[PDB]
PDB file of C-alpha atoms and ligand atoms in Angstrom:
ATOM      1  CA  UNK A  25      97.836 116.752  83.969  1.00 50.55           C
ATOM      2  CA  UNK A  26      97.236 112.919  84.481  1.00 51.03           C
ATOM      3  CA  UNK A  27      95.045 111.045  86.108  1.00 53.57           C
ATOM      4  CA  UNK A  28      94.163 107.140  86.780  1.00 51.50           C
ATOM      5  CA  UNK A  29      92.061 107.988  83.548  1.00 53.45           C
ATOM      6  CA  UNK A  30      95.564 107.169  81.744  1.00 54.54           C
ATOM      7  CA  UNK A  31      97.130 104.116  83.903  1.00 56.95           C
ATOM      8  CA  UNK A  32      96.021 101.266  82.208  1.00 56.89           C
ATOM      9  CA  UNK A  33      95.245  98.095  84.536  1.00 54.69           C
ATOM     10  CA  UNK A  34      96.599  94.665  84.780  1.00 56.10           C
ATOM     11  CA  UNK A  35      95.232  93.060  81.775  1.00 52.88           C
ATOM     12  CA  UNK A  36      96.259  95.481  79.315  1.00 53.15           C
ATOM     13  CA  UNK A  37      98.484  93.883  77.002  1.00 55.00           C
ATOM     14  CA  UNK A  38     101.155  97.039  76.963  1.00 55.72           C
ATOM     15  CA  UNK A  39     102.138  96.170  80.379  1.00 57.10           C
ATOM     16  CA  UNK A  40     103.228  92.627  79.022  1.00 59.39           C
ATOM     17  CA  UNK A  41     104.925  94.186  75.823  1.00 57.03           C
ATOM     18  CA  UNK A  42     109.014  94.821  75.933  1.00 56.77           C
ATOM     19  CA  UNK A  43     109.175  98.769  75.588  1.00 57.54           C
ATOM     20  CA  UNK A  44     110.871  99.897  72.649  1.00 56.50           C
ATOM     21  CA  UNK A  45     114.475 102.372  73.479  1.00 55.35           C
ATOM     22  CA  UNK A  46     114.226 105.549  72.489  1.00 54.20           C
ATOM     23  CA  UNK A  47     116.071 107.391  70.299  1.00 55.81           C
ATOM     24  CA  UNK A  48     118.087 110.708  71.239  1.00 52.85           C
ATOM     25  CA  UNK A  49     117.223 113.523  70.986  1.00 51.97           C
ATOM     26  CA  UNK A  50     114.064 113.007  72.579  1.00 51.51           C
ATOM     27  CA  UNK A  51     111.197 114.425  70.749  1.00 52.60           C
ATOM     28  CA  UNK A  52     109.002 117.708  72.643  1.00 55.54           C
ATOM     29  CA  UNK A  53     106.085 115.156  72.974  1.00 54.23           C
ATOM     30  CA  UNK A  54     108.340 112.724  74.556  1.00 57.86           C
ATOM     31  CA  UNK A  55     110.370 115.040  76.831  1.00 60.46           C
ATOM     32  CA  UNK A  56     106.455 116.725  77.712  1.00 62.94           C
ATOM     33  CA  UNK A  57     105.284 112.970  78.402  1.00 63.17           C
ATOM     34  CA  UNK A  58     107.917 112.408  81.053  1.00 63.54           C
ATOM     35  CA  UNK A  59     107.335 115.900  82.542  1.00 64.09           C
ATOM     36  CA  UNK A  60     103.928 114.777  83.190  1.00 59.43           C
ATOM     37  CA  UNK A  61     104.801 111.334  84.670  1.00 59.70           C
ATOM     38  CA  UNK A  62     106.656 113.086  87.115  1.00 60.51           C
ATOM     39  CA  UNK A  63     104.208 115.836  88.064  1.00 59.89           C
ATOM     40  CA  UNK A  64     101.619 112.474  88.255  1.00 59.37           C
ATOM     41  CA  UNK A  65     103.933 111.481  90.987  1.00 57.14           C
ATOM     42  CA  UNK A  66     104.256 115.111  92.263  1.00 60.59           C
ATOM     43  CA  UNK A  67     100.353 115.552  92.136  1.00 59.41           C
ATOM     44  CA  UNK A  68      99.749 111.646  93.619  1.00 58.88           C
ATOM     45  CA  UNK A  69     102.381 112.705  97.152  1.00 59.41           C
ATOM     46  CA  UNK A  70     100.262 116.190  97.426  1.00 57.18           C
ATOM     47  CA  UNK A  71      97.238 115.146 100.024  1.00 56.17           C
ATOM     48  CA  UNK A  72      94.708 117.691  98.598  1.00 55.79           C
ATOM     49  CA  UNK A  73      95.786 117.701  95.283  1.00 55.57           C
ATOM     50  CA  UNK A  74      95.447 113.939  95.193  1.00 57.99           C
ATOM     51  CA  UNK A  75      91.913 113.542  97.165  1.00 58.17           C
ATOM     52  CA  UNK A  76      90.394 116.386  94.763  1.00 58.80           C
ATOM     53  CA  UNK A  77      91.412 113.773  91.841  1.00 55.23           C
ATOM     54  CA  UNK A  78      91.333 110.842  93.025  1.00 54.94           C
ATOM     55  CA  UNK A  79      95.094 109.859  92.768  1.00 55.12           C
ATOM     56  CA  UNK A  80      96.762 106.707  94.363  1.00 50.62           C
ATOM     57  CA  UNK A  81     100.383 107.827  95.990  1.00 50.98           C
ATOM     58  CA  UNK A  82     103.236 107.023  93.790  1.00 51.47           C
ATOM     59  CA  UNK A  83     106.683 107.002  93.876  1.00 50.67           C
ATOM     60  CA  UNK A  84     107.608 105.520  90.465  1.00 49.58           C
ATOM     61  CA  UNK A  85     105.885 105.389  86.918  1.00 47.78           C
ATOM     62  CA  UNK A  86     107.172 103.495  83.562  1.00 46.28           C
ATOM     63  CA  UNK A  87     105.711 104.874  80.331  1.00 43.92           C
ATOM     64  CA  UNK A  88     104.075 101.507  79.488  1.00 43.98           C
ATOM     65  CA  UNK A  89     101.922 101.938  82.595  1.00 43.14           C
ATOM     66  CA  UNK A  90     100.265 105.296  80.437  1.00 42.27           C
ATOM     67  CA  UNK A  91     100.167 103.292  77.734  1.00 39.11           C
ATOM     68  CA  UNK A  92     103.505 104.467  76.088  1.00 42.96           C
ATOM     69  CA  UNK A  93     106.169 101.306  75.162  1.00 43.39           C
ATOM     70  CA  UNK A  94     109.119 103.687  75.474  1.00 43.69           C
ATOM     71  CA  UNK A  95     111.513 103.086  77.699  1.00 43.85           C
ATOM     72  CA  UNK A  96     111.160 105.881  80.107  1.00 46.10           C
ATOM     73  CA  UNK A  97     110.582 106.104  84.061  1.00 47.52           C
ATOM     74  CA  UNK A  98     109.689 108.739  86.224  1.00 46.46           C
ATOM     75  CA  UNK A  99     111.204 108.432  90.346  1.00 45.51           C
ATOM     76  CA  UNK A 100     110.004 110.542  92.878  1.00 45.85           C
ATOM     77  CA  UNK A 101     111.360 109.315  96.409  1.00 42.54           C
ATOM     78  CA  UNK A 102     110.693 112.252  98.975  1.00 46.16           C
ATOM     79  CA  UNK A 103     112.885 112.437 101.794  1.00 44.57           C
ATOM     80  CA  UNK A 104     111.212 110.691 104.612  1.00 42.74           C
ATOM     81  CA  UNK A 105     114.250 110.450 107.480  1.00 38.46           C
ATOM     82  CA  UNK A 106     117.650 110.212 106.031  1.00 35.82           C
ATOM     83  CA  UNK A 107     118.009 113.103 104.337  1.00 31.73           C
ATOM     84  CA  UNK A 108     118.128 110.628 100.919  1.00 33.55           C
ATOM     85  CA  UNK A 109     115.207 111.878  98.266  1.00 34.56           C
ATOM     86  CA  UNK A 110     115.409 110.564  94.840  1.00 35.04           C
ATOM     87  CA  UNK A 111     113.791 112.909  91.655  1.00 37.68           C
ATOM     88  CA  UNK A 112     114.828 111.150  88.481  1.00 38.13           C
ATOM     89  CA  UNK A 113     113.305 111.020  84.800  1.00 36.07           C
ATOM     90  CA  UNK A 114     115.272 108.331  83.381  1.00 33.33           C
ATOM     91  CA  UNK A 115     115.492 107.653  79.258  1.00 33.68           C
ATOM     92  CA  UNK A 116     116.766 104.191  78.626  1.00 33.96           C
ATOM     93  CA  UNK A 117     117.760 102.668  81.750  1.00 34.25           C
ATOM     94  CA  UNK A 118     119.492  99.285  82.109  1.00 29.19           C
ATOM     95  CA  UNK A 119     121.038  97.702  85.402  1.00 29.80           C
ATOM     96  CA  UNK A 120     124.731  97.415  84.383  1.00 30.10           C
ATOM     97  CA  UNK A 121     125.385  95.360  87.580  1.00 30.38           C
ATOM     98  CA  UNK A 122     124.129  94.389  91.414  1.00 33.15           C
ATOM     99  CA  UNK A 123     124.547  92.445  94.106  1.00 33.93           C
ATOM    100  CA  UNK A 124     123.874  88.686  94.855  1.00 33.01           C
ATOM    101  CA  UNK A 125     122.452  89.533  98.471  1.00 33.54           C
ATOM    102  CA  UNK A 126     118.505  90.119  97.501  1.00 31.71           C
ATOM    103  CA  UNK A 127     116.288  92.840  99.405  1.00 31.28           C
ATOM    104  CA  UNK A 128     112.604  92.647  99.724  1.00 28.96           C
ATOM    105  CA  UNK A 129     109.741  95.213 101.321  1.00 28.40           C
ATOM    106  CA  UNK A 130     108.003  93.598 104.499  1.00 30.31           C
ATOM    107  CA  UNK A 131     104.491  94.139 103.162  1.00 31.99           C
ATOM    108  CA  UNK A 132     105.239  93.488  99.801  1.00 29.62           C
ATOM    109  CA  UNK A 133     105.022  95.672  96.627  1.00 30.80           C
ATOM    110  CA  UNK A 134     101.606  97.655  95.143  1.00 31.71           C
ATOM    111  CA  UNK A 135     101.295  98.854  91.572  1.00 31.01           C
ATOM    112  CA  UNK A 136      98.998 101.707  89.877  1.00 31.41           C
ATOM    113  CA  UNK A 137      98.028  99.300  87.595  1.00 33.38           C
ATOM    114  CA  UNK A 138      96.812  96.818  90.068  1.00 34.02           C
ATOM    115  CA  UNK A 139      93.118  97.472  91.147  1.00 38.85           C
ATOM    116  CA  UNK A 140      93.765  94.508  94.038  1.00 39.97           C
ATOM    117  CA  UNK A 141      96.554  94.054  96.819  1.00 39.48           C
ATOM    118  CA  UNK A 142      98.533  90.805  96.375  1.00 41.83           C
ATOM    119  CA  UNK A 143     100.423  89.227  99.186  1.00 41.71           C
ATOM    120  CA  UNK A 144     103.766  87.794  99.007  1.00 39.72           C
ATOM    121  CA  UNK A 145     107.711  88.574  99.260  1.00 42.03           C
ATOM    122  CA  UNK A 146     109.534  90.385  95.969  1.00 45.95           C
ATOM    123  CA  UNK A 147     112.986  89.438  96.145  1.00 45.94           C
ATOM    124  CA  UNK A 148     115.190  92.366  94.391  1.00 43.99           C
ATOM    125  CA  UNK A 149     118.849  93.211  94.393  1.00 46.32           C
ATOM    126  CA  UNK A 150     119.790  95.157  97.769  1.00 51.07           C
ATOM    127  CA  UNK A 151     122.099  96.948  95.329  1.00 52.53           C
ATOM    128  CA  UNK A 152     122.230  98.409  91.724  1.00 52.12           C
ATOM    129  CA  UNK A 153     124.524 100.218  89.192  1.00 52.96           C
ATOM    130  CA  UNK A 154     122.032 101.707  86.586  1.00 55.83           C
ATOM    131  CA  UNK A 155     123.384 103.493  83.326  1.00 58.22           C
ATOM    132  CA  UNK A 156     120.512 105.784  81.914  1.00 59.43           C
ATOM    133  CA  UNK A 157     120.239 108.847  79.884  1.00 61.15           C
ATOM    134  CA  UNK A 158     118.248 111.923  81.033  1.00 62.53           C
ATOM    135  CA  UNK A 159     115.536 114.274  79.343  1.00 61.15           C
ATOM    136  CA  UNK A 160     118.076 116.196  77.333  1.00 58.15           C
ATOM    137  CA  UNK A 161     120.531 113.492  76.512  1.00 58.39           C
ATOM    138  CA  UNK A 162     123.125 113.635  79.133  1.00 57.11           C
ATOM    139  CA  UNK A 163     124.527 110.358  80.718  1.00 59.34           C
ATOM    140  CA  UNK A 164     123.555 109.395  84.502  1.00 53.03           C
ATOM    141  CA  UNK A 165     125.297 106.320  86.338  1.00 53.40           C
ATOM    142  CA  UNK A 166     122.922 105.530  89.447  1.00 53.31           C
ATOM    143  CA  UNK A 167     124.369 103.420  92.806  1.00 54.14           C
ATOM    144  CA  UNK A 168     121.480 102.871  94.526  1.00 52.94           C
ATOM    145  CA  UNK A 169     120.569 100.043  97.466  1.00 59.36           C
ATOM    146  CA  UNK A 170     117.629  99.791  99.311  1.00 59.49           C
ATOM    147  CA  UNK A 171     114.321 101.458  99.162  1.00 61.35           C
ATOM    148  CA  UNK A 172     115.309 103.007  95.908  1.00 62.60           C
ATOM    149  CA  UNK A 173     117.322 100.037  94.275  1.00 60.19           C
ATOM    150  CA  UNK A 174     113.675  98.091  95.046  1.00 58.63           C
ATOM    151  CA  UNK A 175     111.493 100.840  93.144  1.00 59.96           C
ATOM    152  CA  UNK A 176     113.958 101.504  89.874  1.00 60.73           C
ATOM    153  CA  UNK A 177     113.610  97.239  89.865  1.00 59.80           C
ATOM    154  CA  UNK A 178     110.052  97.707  90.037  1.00 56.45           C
ATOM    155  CA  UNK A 179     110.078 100.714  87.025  1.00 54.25           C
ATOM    156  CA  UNK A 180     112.651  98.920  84.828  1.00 56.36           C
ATOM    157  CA  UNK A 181     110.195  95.719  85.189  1.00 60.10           C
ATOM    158  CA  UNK A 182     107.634  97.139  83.307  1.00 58.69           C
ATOM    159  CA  UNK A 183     110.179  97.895  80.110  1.00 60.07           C
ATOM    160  CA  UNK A 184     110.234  94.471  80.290  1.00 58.34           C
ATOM    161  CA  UNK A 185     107.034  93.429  80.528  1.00 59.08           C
ATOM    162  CA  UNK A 186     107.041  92.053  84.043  1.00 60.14           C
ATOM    163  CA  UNK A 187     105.053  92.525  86.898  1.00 58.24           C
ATOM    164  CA  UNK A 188     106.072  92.889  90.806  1.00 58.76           C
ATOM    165  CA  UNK A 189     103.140  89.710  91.556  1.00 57.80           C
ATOM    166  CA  UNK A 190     105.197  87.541  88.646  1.00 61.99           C
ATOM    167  CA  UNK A 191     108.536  87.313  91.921  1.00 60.00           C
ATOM    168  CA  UNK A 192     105.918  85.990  94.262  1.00 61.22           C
ATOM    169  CA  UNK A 193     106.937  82.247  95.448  1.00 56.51           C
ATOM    170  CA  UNK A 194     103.407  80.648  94.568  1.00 56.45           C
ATOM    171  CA  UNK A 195     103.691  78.268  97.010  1.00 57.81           C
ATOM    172  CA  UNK A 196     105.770  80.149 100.073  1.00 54.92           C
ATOM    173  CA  UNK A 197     104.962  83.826  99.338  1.00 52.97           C
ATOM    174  CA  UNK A 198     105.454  84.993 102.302  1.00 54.41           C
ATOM    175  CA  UNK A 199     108.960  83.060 103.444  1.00 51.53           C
ATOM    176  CA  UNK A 200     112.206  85.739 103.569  1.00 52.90           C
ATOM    177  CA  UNK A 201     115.014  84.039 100.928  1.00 52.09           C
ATOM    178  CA  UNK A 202     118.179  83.287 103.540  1.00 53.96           C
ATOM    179  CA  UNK A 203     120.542  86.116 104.139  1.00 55.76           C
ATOM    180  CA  UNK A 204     117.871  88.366 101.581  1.00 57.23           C
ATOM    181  CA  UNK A 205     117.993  92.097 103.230  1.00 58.02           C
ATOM    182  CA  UNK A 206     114.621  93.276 105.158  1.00 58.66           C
ATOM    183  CA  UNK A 207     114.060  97.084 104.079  1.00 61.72           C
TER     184      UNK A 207
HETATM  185  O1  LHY B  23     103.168 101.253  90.718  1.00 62.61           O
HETATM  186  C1  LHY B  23     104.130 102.000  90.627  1.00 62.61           C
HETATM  187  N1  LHY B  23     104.831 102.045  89.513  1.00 62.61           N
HETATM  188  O2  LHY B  23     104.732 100.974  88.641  1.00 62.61           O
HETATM  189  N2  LHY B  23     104.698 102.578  91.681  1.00 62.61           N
HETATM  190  C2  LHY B  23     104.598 101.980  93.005  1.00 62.61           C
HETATM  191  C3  LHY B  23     106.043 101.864  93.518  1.00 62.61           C
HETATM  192  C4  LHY B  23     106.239 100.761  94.547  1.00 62.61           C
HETATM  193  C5  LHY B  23     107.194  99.776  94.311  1.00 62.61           C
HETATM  194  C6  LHY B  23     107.383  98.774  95.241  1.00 62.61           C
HETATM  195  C7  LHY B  23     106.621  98.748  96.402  1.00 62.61           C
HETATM  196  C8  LHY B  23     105.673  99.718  96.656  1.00 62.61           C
HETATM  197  C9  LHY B  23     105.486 100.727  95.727  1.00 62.61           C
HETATM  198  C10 LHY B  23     103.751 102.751  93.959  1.00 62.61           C
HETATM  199  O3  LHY B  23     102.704 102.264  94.415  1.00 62.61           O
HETATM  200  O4  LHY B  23     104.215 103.956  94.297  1.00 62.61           O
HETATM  201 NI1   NI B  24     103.326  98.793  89.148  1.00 65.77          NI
END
């Protein structure tokens, strides 16, 4: 299983590297990998499980933050009210469109990676169309808004080698943009 042993930390140059796309089929180490970066997510959400090792609660994880530039994520939204959960293992996701109406979480945005809090507004996309592949090759097309559309953002940053703290307005970080969608 994993551990915060294998989440490298802010400073780490793989989290500023562009992960590479992977090529399909996946290979049984990769498809094993993102097994695991689910059941990291899994074991983080699980109160014992995660006090007995020390995990941080989770909802998303991108390869690079393990140390692996490959373009994978791992999503584990549970329910919590609407009857909406979200359990995806994505192989090479892109955002194929979204909305011009932005969306940002009231407290901000936290990150395994990231040993501090930071303060300060991350402006996202309320909505998203993502076009991905799964673990065995089959195609998924993703309409998310919300909650969700803010944490694939989040995941498909780190592919790119950006972090949530790089959206903060340096000077205002705290100011909502006009019209931008409180979640
Ligand atoms: O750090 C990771 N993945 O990179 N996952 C974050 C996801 C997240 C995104 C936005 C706001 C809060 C939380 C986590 O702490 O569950
Ligand atoms: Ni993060």
């Amino acid at each position: 299983m994993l551990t915060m042993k294998d989440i490298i930390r802010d400073g780490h140059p793989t989290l500023r590297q562009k992960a590479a796309e992977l090529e399909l089929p996946l290979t049984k180490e990769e498809k094993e990998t993102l097994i695991a970066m689910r059941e990291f997510l899994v074991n983080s959400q699980d109160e014992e499980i995660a006090k007995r090792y020390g995990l941080r609660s989770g909802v998303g994880l991108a390869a690079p933050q393990i140390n692996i530039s490959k373009r994978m994520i791992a999503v584990l939204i549970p329910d919590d009210g609407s009857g909406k959960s979200y359990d995806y293992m994505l192989v090479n996701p892109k955002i194929v469109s979204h909305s011009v109406q932005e969306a940002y979480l009231p407290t901000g945005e936290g990150c395994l990676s990231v040993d501090d809090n930071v303060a300060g507004l991350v402006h996202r996309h309320n909505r998203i169309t993502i076009k991905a592949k799964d673990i065995e090759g089959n195609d998924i097309q993703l309409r998310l808004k919300g909650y969700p559309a803010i944490v694939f953002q989040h995941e498909i940053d780190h592919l790119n080698g950006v972090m949530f703290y790089d959206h903060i307005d340096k000077n205002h970080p705290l100011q909502p943009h006009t019209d931008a969608v409180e979640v």
